[PDB]
Amino acid sequence: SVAHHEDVYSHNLPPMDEKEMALYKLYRPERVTPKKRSAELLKEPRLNKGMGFSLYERQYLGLHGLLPPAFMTQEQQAYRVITKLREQPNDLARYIQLDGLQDRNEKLFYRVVCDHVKELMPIVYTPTVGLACQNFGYIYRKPKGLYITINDNSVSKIYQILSNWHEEDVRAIVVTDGERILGLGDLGAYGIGIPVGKLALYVALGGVQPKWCLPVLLDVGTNNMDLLNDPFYIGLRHKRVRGKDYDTLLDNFMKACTKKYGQKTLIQFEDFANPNAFRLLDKYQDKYTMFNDDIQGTASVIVAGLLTCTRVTKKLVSQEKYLFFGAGAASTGIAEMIVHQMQNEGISKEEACNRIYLMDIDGLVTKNRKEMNPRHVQFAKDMPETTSILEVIRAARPGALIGASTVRGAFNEEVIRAMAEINERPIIFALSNPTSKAECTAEEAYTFTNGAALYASGSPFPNFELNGHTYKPGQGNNAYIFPGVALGTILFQIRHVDNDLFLLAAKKVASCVTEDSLKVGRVYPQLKEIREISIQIAVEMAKYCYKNGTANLYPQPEDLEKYVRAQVYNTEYEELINATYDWPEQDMRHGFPVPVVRHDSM
Amino acid sequence: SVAHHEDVYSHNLPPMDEKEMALYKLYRPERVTPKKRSAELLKEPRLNKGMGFSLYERQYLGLHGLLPPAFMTQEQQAYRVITKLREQPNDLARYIQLDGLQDRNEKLFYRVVCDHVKELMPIVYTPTVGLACQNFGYIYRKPKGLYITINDNSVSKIYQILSNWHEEDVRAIVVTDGERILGLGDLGAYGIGIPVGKLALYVALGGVQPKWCLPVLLDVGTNNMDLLNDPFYIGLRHKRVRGKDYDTLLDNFMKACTKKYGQKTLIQFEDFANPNAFRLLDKYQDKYTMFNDDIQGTASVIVAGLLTCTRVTKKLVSQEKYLFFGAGAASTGIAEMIVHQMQNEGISKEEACNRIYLMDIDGLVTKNRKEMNPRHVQFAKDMPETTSILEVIRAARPGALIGASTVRGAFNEEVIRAMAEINERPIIFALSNPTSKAECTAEEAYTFTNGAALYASGSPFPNFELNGHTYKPGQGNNAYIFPGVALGTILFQIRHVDNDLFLLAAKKVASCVTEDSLKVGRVYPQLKEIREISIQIAVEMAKYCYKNGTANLYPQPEDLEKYVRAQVYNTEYEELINATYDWPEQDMRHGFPVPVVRHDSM
Amino acid sequence: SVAHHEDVYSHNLPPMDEKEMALYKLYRPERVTPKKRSAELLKEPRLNKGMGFSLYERQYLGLHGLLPPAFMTQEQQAYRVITKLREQPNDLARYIQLDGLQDRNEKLFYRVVCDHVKELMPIVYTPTVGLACQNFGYIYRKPKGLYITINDNSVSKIYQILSNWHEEDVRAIVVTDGERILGLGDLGAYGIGIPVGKLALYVALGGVQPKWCLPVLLDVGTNNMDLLNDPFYIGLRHKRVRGKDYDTLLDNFMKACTKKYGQKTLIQFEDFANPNAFRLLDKYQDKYTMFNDDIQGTASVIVAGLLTCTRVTKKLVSQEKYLFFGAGAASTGIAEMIVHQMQNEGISKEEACNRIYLMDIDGLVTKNRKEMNPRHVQFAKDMPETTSILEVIRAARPGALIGASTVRGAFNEEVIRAMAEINERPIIFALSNPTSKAECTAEEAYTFTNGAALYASGSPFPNFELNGHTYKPGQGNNAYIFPGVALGTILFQIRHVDNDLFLLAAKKVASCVTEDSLKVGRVYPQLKEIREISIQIAVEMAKYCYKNGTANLYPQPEDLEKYVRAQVYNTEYEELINATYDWPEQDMRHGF
C-alpha cells in the first residue's frame, strides 16, 4: 500500500511544477476495477490479458489454473501473434485470426495492429473485410455489433435493442445498411463486419476509447439475388424496403440512439448506396453529430494530398486547374471540397468552379448537356463537347489530373505525356480501386514523366526506382482523416461536423508531410503517424470550435493537447486491482477510541 | 405479445395527432429491465414492489415463495404504511420506519411521502432528521450515502470512492461537512442523514429521478467535545481541519465529482457553518453547477412570500421598506436578494438599500458603527443609534417586519401594534426556528393587528379563528424553491445558478398562491402543490436560460413542458419484464428459408 | 497474500507431527473468496463485517466510502450491540434488533448470541419468537425463509420455489404449517419466524453451518378467526385445508426437497398440530432423514433429566416407577421414550409399561376406559378409577412425578409431601409452560420436600435458598438435544434418526452434568456448554451409526472429533481476499 503522505499510483513520475502536477492529476485516467472474476473475467476482451497476467494477479482475481503455467509480457504476446499471422495461408485467414484476437485480448489486439499498421490495416478493414463478409457469410464470434431491422421500426424497439448492448457509455456509432460495401456491392446482413472494422480503426488510428464504440447494421432487406437464393443467408429474406418506411427507420434510429446515449453521440454512416448516402448526409448533417466518411472523408483526404502537392507545384489550390476523369460520388465530392477550400483562400465560388473540369462516361460535362446531375450544374463548362482526355487536357491545360472512374489504365502514356508537358510537376491521382482498376500505376506515372509527376493512388503501389531516384507513391487513404475527426468530435462534443472541419483536418494532414518523404515523391504522411496526426487534428478542431461556440464540452480545458493526450486509448496493460493507501496510523486503528468497561454475561 | 403493426407499451392512449404522437414517443420513458432476480432483486429498493408483485411477476422473476402469499396494490400498501406510521410512539420512530421504507420499496416510499407531504415532510427532513442524527448516532441501514474524509485528499482517492457507488448516472449531489446541522450544531460524521433527507425531498417534491441522487458527507473532524468523548462516535476522532488542507479537500472534491460524473453535475452545499458556507458559495458559484440552499434557498423563498404580500399591500417590493430584526446569515441573505429583486424592478442599488434596515444584537446598524460585516456596509443607516425596535419602527415606519434572530417573542404586542398603525396590512415574518424561538406566534400577530397582519413563519403554526375570520398562517419553507431549481438545473444542464434564477423561482412560487388562500391570510402555496410548482419552475428556467445561452442541453426541446413532464419521477409501479412484439409472420419463421436435401450420416 | 516453500494460510500453527500436519490440512476449512463488491457485498450478511472491515479490505473490495471512517474489532462491535440490546424497552424490541442483526452481519449475530446464550436464547426463540409473530405480523426483513402453499401443490411447483433460494448447498430444513406455535396456537403465515429462530439455534448452539439452513412455512390457510378477519393478515385468507390435498402437499414437499438437495437433507418438523405432528413423523421417519423436536426432542431432553436423576436415586430408569400427570402429546411421548430406554436396559416392554402410570382430565387411565387413546392402551392400568394424584401415589408408589398438564399448582403441598414421604429424593418435574401454568414452582418442590426433591421444569425459575442452602433448578429445554442431533445427522449423513439416537443424545447430556451442579439440585448442564455437548453428541452418533452402517458419509473419517471440530461454524471473521503464494523464481518470470 501507499504511504499516508502519497497519492495512489503516482510513482516514478517526471519532475512537475505545483501547477503542472495538478493539471496532470486532473486530466489523467483513473484506475477502474472490474467486478468479474475467474472464467468470466478471462472471457471479457477488455479485461483479459491472457498469459500476460502475473501469478499474483491470477491468484487474486481467481484466474489461477485456468491459464497455462507460462507468463508473458505484452511484447512477447504480440510476437506470438504476428508470427502466427504471417504463417497464415492467406489474408482471409488473417482476418479471422485478428477478429478472434479482438474478442480475446483487446489490449493485445490494438497493440499488434498499431505496431504493424501498414501490414495489418488492409486486413482489419480496407479490402479484406469486405471479401470476408462475402465469402464467409455468418462468422462465428462474440456479440460485437447490433442488428436493427425494418421490423424494429420505432424509437422504443430500437431503444430496447440498444439496451441489450453491454456498454452504457457509447459515444461513437458507425452504421451501414450494407447496400454498398466498397468494391463488393450489396451483401445485406453480412455487412456487419464493415462497421466493426471501421470502429477498430477509430481505436487503433484515432485513439478513440474502444468502450465508446458501437457497430450497427440496419437490415431492410437485400437486392442481391444470390443472397435471396442462398439457403445460408441470415438476413431478412426480401428485397430492400425504400419508401417512407425506410426513411422512418432511419429517423427513429437517430432518435433512439440520441435518446439513449445523448445528443452528442457521434453517428457515422458507412457504405450506403451513393445517392442514398448523400441524401442522408444532407438530412442529418445539421441535426445530429453525424458525417459520412465515403463522401466527406474521401473528399477530405484527397484535398490533403493536393494541398501537399502545392508545396511542390508552387501553385496554391486556388491557383491551380483540376481535371477529373469520372464524375460520380468520389470525384464530385472531391471537387466540391476543392471549391470550398479555394473560397477559404480568397477566390469566389464562381471562379473556383472555373478551375474544375469534369468528365464522365459521356465525356466532358458541358453547359450544353441534356440532363445532368444538379451537383454538376456549377461545374459544367462553356466549351465544345468531346470524349478525348487529350483534347480536354490540351484545351484546359490542367495542372492536376484526378481519376475516379473504374476504368483500368485510362491514363495511358499519351495522357501522362500530355500532363508532363503543360506542367513541370504534373499531379496525377489514380483513385479507382483496387489497383487492378487504377487509371494508371505509379510506375507508369513516373516513367512517362521522367519521374516528375506528383502521384497518389487509391490502392497501394510498390516503390519505384528510376535512374537512381527512388519513389514512394502514396495512398489517399481515408484513415488519415476520419480517426482524428472522430476523436476531436467526441472529446469536445462538437455539435455538428461541417466542411470547414474536414478542411482543417486536411490541412493538418498536409502539414505533417515531412521533407524526407517529399523528396521521395510522397504527398501523404506514413500510416504509423496517424495516431499523432489524429491528436493534432483533435486539438486543432477544439481551437476552431471553441471560437465559434460549437464545442459543447464545458468548460474549455486549460491545456487542450494535454487533455487530449490523457484521453486517448493506451494499448498498455493496466492494473485491475484496487490501489491501497494508508491513513494516518492513529486513524486506521481498530478498537474503541475511548475505553469502556467490558460487559458481563450469564 | 404486441401485434406486428403496433408499438410496445402503447395501449389505451389518449387521441393524438401524427405530430403529437411522435413528440410523445420521443420524450416518453422507455422500459428498463433489471438483471437481478430472486432475493437479490427483492433487496434492491428501486426494483422491489414487495407483495405488490403479481403472481406472474413473482414466478417469472424468481421471487415466488420468498414473499407471503398475499397480493396488494400500491394503494393498499401505502395504507398499511401510513397506518403503522401513525401508530408509532413518536417522530423519531417514524423517521426510522421511513428510512427503512426507503431502503425496502423506493416507489412505495415516495408514494406514501408524496401522498402525505404535510404530515411526513417534517419527519423525512425539516426538524426530525437532525434530532435522529444526534440521538441515534450510527443508524443501521443500506449504504445510501458516501463518506469522504480529510484522509482521502486527492482527486484519485475521492474518484475511487465515487466508483464504489452503485449508480453511474449521478446528476445531483448534496454535500455537508456536518458542522452546522440546522438547530443542532456540529454532529460530525453523524450528519449523513441530512444529505439523505434533502435528496429524498429532491425526488418527492421536485420530481428529480432518484437514481441521479448521491448524498455525501465530508469528514474533517468535529469540534463537538461530546462526540470526541463518546466511545460510540464513528467519525474521525479529532477537531475539524481548516487550513489549506480543508480547502484542498473541497477543491479535490468538486474536481473528482465532475471528472467522474461530468461538469454538469449539480452539487448542492447543505448545513455548513455560516461563514464557511458563504465563502464556499462565492468560490464555486461561477465555476461549477452549485448552490447553497441555506443561503440562496432561504433568501429566495422569503422573497417569494414578500412578493405575494405585494398583491395585498398593493406596494411593490421596490415600493416597500423592510426592517430586519437580526442580521446574521438568514437576514443578510434575504436582504441582498430583496436588493437584487428591487433593481430588476427599476430602482438603483443605492436606493434599494435605503429601503432596508438591519438590527442585530447591538441594535440598529448605523454608518457610525465600529467594526461591521462587509455585507452590511451598503445597508448601514445614516441615523441615530438605538436598541429599541419601537424606536427604529417609528423612525423608518417600515411596511414589513422580518425577524431572523433566535430571540423568542421579541415581537411583542407593542411592536406588533406599532406595525399595525403605520400600515393597513403589516407584514410580519417570524423566521427563527423552531416555533419555540419564533419572534412571535401567528395567533399573536393576528390578535394584535385585529387580523390584518400578513404573517409567515419559519416553523408551522396552527390555524387561527378570530371574530369569524379564519387564518391559515404559512411557512417560509425552502422546499418551495430548491426542488424546482434542482429539477430545472438538471434536466436542462444549466451551467451555473445565479440570483436571477432564484428570483425567477421566487416569482413562480408567488404566482401560484391562489385567491382562496390569500383570503385566509396565506402567502405561500400548499405543500402538496410543490411537484407542480417544481415543474413550472423547471420550464421557466429553461426559457430564461436558452435566451442567454446558459442551458447546455442541446438542442432546446420542441415542447419544454412536455419534455419536463416526461422526465419527472413516477411513483407508480412499472413493468420490469421486457415487452414482446411480433414481426411479420413470415419473418419470424424457424427453419431453412430455402429448401435443401438433408445430409446423410454413417 | 505468501514463500514458495510455504503453504497458504499456515502461519503460527501449533507443533504437529508429519501425520498430524497431514490430517490437519485434510480436514481444515479452506478460504472462499466472494464475487460481490461494494454495496452488494455490504448487503450480504454472510460476508459483511461492517465497520469491522479494515481500511485495506475496504479499498480492495470497493467498500471504502460506503462505511463510516471508524474501524472496529469484532469484540467492539459485539459490545455496541449488547449495549443497545439492554437499552431496549422490552424483549419484543430486542427480538427486532436481533432479527435485524442476523440480516446485517451474520458472524457478529452469532458471536453475540453465543456470548450471551442464557440472556438471548429466550429472545431468539423460546418464548419471545412466538409473541413477536403474533404481535408484529409481516415484519420487514431480507428474505430469510420460504413460503410454500396449498396452491403450489406439485413436486415441480415446490421445486421452483426452492430454486428461488440463494444457497444451493442446503442440508437442514425446519418446517412448520404454523398451526400450533407453542404457547400461542394457530398463527398461520405469521409463523415463519419459528423455523427461522429454530435454525438460528442450530447454528449458535449446534455449530451447524448457517449456509446449510432453510426455514420453511407451509401455508394451507388458518383457523385463527382474528387473522382471517384481520385486513392486515398476509397468509391465505381461508380456513385450513386438511383432506387428501394436505397429505399430498406434504408428500410433494418431502419429494421436492430431497430431489432438490438430496436424500441426505435433514427435514425437521416444528409446531404442527399434535395429530399431524405424530402422523407425519410416523409416516416420514423411516423414509426420510426427518424428525420432530416437539415430540422427540422433548421426550429425549426429559429422559436426559431422569437419567441424571438416577445418579442421585441409585435407581436406573428400568428400576423406577413414573407417574405422569397429564397424558397428552408431551407426556405420552416421554413415556414411550422412557419405555424404549427401559427395554434397552434389559427389561421387557412388559415391566416397562407396567412401571408407568398415566392420568388426564378424566383421571387415571385404567383398563376400564371408554374410548381411550390407542397409544395409552399399553399403559392403561388395571386398577380403581380415581382423580386424586395422592390416591395414585399411595397406590403405585411412584419414584417420580411428571407433569405435562396445563394445570397450575396441580402439585400441592399434600402431593409433594406424599412424594417426599415415599421417596428419599423424589423426582418432581413440572413441565407445563409458561411458569404461570407449572404444576408447581421450584420453591414449592423444595420447601415442601426439604430440598430433597430432584426438580426440573419446562420454563425457568430463579435460584432458591432453603436452610442456608442455595438451589438452582434446571430446565428441560429441547435446546440441549436437537442442535447436537442435527449436527451429527448432517455431518455424517445419517439415513434416519430413531429412538436409540435420541437416547444416545440423552445419555450424553446426562453425562455432562457436573457433580457441583448436582449438589445444587441442577439435573441439566449449563446452557453455555451446549456447543461442546453438540460436538460430543455428533461424535457419539457417528460411532453408533458407523457400527450399524447408517452413516452415509464415506469413508468414516479417521478422527471423528477432529473432523467434527473442523466442520462446525466459526464466529470469527475470515479473510475474503485470496491468499497469494510464490512459485520458484525461475518459473514466474514473464517474457521469453
Ligand SMILES: NC(=O)C1=CN([C@@H]2O[C@H](COP(=O)(O)OP(=O)(O)OC[C@H]3O[C@@H](n4cnc5c(N)ncnc54)[C@H](O)[C@@H]3O)[C@@H](O)[C@H]2O)C=CC1
Ligand atoms: N469511400 C469511397 O467510396 C472511395 C472510392 N474510391 C474509388 O473511386 C471510384 C469511383 O467511385 P464512385 O464515384 O462511387 O463510382 P460512381 O458510379 O459514383 O462514379 C463513376 C464515374 O465515372 C464515370 N465513368 C465510368 N466509366 C467511364 C469511362 N470509360 N470513361 C469516362 N468516365 C467513366 C461515370 O459516368 C461516373 O461519373 C471507385 O473505383 C472507388 O473504388 C476512392 C476513394 C474512396
Ligand SMILES: NC(=O)C1=CN([C@@H]2O[C@H](COP(=O)(O)OP(=O)(O)OC[C@H]3O[C@@H](n4cnc5c(N)ncnc54)[C@H](O)[C@@H]3O)[C@@H](O)[C@H]2O)C=CC1
Ligand atoms: N436554512 C437556514 O439556515 C434557515 C434558518 N432560519 C432561522 O433564522 C434564524 C437565524 O439564523 P442565522 O442568520 O444563521 O443565525 P446568525 O448567528 O447567522 O444570525 C443571528 C443574528 O441575530 C442577531 N441577534 C441575536 N440575539 C439578538 C437580540 N436579542 N436582539 C437583536 N438582534 C439579535 C445577531 O447579532 C445576528 O445578526 C435561526 O433561528 C434559524 O433557525 C430560517 C430559515 C432558514
Ligand SMILES: NC(=O)C1=CN([C@@H]2O[C@H](COP(=O)(O)OP(=O)(O)OC[C@H]3O[C@@H](n4cnc5c(N)ncnc54)[C@H](O)[C@@H]3O)[C@@H](O)[C@H]2O)C=CC1
Ligand atoms: N415442545 C413441546 O411441545 C413441549 C410442551 N411442553 C408443555 O407440556 C404441556 C402439555 O402439552 P401437550 O401434551 O402438547 O398438550 P396436550 O393437549 O396434548 O395434553 C394435555 C393433557 O393433559 C390433560 N389434562 C388437562 N386438564 C387437566 C386436569 N385438570 N387434570 C388432569 N389432567 C388434565 C389432558 O386430558 C391431556 O391428556 C404444555 O403446558 C406444554 O407447554 C413442555 C415441553 C415441550
Ligand SMILES: O=C([O-])C(O)C(=O)[O-]
Ligand atoms: O498465443 C497468442 O496468440 C498470444 O501469446 C496470446 O496470449 O494471446
Ligand SMILES: O=C([O-])C(O)C(=O)[O-]
Ligand atoms: O407492510 C407494509 O409496510 C407494506 O404493505 C409493504 O408492502 O411494504
Ligand SMILES: O=C([O-])C(O)C(=O)[O-]
Ligand atoms: O453498532 C453496532 O450495532 C455494531 O458495532 C455493528 O457494527 O453492527
